[PDB]
Amino acid sequence: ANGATSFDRTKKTITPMGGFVHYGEIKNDFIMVKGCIPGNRKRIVTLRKSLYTNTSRKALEEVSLKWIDTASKFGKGRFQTPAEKHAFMGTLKKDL
């Protein structure tokens, strides 16, 4: 329930279905940061404390997520979970 939320609560991790594209899973502690970061997927990055105390009010805002999109990135993502998928889908020629 790592990519779950107080408002979502469904046990799921941040890893999108089929995984992150060109990376992997993320089985360790992770940093969710607003927006985009220099560097590309798989690159070593260094996160660093601010050099000043920002009174911005843009910072100082204390966020709480409602929801974290876990749908597949590789292709046009429909479903969050294989559970949720199997729900809407119905039953297919393989299955149980």
């Binding site: 408002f7 409602k66 929801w67 999109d69 749908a71 046009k76 993502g77 429909r78 479903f79 969050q80 809407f88 119905g90 039953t91």
Partner: protein, 98 residues
């Protein structure tokens, strides 16, 4: 945070996904992706497009156990009998005979 559905394909649209078309009459059409959105622009009719919810509903596809039975009901038999008339004598005058 609503999850809408595709006015063409019948697919869940989770937030910030696909496009939203506002037609001339003010009818709003929501698409999950550029597939519906283009099939829509092409004047395709979802009931003829085999992978559509709408198509599947009309063709009776995979629904099964939603047409299977269930159990929802009650058993009650309670006695009110009437307002302004003494409800004491409403079960004394009701013992029936037959």
């Amino acid at each position: 945070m609503k999850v809408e559905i595709d006015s063409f394909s019948g697919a869940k649209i989770y937030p910030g996904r696909g496009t939203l078309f506002v037609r001339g009459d003010s009818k709003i059409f929501r698409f999950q992706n550029s597939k519906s959105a283009s099939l829509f622009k092409q004047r395709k009719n979802p009931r003829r497009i085999a992978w559509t919810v709408l198509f599947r509903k009309h063709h009776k596809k995979g629904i099964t156990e939603e047409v299977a039975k269930k159990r929802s009901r009650k058993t009650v038999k309670a006695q009110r009998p009437i307002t302004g008339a003494s409800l004491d004598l409403i079960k004394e005058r009701r013992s029936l005979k037959p």
